[PDB]
Amino acid sequence: STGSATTTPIDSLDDAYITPVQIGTPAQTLNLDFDTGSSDLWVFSSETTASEVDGQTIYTPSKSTTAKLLSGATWSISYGDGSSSSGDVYTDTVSVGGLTVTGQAVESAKKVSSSFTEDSTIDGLLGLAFSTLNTVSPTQQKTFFDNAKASLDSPVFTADLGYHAPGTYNFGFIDTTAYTGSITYTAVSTKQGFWEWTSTGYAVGSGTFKSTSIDGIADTGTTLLYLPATVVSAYWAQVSGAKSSSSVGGYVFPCSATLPSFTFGVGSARIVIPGDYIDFGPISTGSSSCFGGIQSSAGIGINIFGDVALKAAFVVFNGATTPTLGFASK
Numbered sequence: 001s002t003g004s005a006t007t008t009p010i011d012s013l014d015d016a017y018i019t020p021v022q023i024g025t026p027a028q029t030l031n032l033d034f035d036t037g038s039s040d041l042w043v044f045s046s047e048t049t050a051s052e053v054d055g056q057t058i059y060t061p062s063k064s065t066t067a068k069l070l071s072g073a074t075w076s077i078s079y080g081d082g083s084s085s086s087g088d089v090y091t092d093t094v095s096v097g098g099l100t101v102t103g104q105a106v107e108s109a110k111k112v113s114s115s116f117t118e119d120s121t122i123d124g125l126l127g128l129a130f131s132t133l134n135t136v137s138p139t140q141q142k143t144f145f146d147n148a149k150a151s152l153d154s155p156v157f158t159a160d161l162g163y164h165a166p167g168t169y170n171f172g173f174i175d176t177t178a179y180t181g182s183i184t185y186t187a188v189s190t191k192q193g194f195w196e197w198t199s200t201g202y203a204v205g206s207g208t209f210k211s212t213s214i215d216g217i218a219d220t221g222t223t224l225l226y227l228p229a230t231v232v233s234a235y236w237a238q239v240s241g242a243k244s245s246s247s248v249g250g251y252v253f254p255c256s257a258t259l260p261s262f263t264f265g266v267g268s269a270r271i272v273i274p275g276d277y278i279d280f281g282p283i284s285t286g287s288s289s290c291f292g293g294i295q296s297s298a299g300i301g302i303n304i305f306g307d308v309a310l311k312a313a314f315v316v317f318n319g320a321t322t323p324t325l326g327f328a329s330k
């Protein structure tokens with residue numbers, strides 16, 4: 001089997017991407033944030049504290065003939081940006097772009113943090129990291145991909161995120177028309193439950209490539225590119241007027257600037273992030289100070305190849321017995 005679904009930026013900055021997902025019988029379609037940095041599929045629901053729902057579409061398990069309460073199961077998750085959610089668990093039929101999994105764990109939110117409430121466009125998350133990170137207790141549950149894998153034509157999914165435009169998540173096949181040149185594959189460590197890999201280095205604009213190992217995760221659920229302070233300093237030094245602002249919470253730059261590209265290494269291959277991908281607009285409405293899309297990972301504990309990097313590439317998440325990651329230009 002295969003699946004193919006369009007993923008769409010939630011706003012003009014590509015802050016996140018939503019993908020429609022069919023849950024239950026008859027189908028209830030929710031727009032979920034596909035997140036290769038986590039492993040829970042959770043949704044706003046009829047069980048979510050009423051005051052914490054503000055415009056989201058909710059899953060109502062009582063209206064699904066295939067929904068079953070997973071007795072005694074609870075979940076609770078906190079993300080890297082400080083947001084969180086928790087609740088109980090159902091199993092139900094879940095379909096993405098024509099690909100169907102029966103008995104998928106659908107984690108129903110009873111509580112969500114303010115940042116989820118305030119984002120009316122995201123109805124929940126669909127985790128695509130390794131199932132070892134799944135927070136369901138006392139019986140850990142499998143991701144949608146993990147459940148689908150055996151049935152897929154090939155045990156892979158691909159992320160093809162657009163810049164200010166729709167893109168595609170495919171399951172079970174590689175669309176050879178969706179990228180240019182070749183796909184370069186690179187080793188993955190699953191020890192932390194992430195799609196963790198090692199970039200071979202970087203370049204700023206037309207500058208010389210610096211060969212240096214940068215360990216990080218491929219994370220579709222993170223907006224920006226988070227890299228070591230040395231690398232980030234080298235980038236923003238090429239932008240006149242750019243500076244790190246503790247009050248704003250990262251590097252900012254004059255909105256009148258022209259940003260240089262940023263290149264990262266995948267083996268001997270190179271992925272080029274165009275300068276305008278790194279522009280996240282005024283820090284507040286009407287400001288002439290703009291927020292940078294490349295930021296220091298120093299306070300995180302890990303480097304993150306988030307959407308700013310991934311949307312510059314066609315990315316293969318290869319879930320073979322020994323997982324690997326593939327990157328192509330597009």
Ligand SMILES: Cc1cccc([C@H]2C[C@@H](O)[C@@H](O)[C@@H]2N)c1
Pocket residue numbers: 015223224248249280281282283284291
């Ligand atoms: C501080 C700031 C200013 C302008 C824009 C942002 C973006 C960057 C990324 O973290 C996303 O979640 C934010 N909406 C952040």
